[PDB]
Nucleic acid binder design. Structure first.
Length: 134
RNA sequence: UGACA
């Protein structure tokens, strides 16, 4: 009861995460907190086991969002991820994870780990990688 | 000088 946060779980996508979070908080409230939970935090891309620092949860696009390829092949997250790495999205109706370095614009550290992630593949971490050297 | 977006 009234449980929150998660000490860097082994395996679980932030979709499954933000999912349980969907079963608690209100609507407006929901989105506000959830993000705070993943924001500044990082996720593990199941398809390419690569972790990026989620600084913003894209509560607009779904794992279906598309984009053209080299020659212009329009493939969706679901596709690019399923065909190239086969990570079966499945929850093709949740948001996205806009991972951004969002450096402190201070001196010249420049933060790393930017990426448009699928919440259904992001193994919640706890990295919160700050590494920049400002 | 934004490293499988």
């Amino acid at each position: 009861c009234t449980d929150v946060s998660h000490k860097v779980l082994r395996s679980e996508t932030v979709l499954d995460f933000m999912f349980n979070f969907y079963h608690q908080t209100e609507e407006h409230k929901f989105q506000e907190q959830v993000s705070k939970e993943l924001i500044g935090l990082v996720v593990l891309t199941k398809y390419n086991n690569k972790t990026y620092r989620v600084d913003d949860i894209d509560w607009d696009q779904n794992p279906k969002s598309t984009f053209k390829k080299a020659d212009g092949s329009e493939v969706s997250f679901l596709e690019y991820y399923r065909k190239q790495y086969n990570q079966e999205i499945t929850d093709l109706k949740q948001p996205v994870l806009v991972s951004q370095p969002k450096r402190r614009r201070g001196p010249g550290g420049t933060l790393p780990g930017p990426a448009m992630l699928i919440p259904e593949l992001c193994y919640l971490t706890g990295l919160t990688d700050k590494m920049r050297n400002d």
